[PDB]
Amino acid sequence: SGAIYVGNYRVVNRHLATHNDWANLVWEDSSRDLLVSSTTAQGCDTIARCDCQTGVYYCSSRRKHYPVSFSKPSLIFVEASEYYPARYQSHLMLAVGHSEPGDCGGILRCQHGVVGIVSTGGNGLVGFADVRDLLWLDE
Ligand X SMILES: NC(=O)[C@H]1CCCN(C(=O)Cc2cccc3c2SCC3)C1
Please report, in range form, the residues annotated as the binding site. 50, 52, 110, 112
From the candidates 33, 59, 91, 130, which is the catalytic residue? 33
* Burial of 40 from C-beta contacts in 10 A (0-12 / 13-18 / 19+): exposed
Q: Which of 116, 134, 10 has the alpha carbon at shortest distance from 72?
A: 116
Strand pairing report for 87-96 and 54-59? unpaired
Partner in contact with 133, chosen from ligand X, Zn ion, none, beta carbon below 5 to 8 Å by kind: none
Q: Can 33 be counted among the known catalytic residues?
A: yes
| Window 63 to 122, contacts with ligand X (CB under 6 A) | 78, 81, 83-84, 89, 99-101, 103-104, 118-122
**Phi first, then psi: what are they for 45, rounded to 5°?**
-70, 135
Position among 50, 75, 96, 125 found at the interface with Zn ion (CB under 5 A): 50
Overall residue count recorded for the chain in this entry: 139
Q: Can 15 be counted among the known catalytic residues?
A: yes
Q: Give catalytic residues, as residue numbers.
A: 15, 33, 104
Q: Please give the residue ranges that form the binding site for Zn ion (CB under 5 A).
A: 48, 50, 52, 110, 112
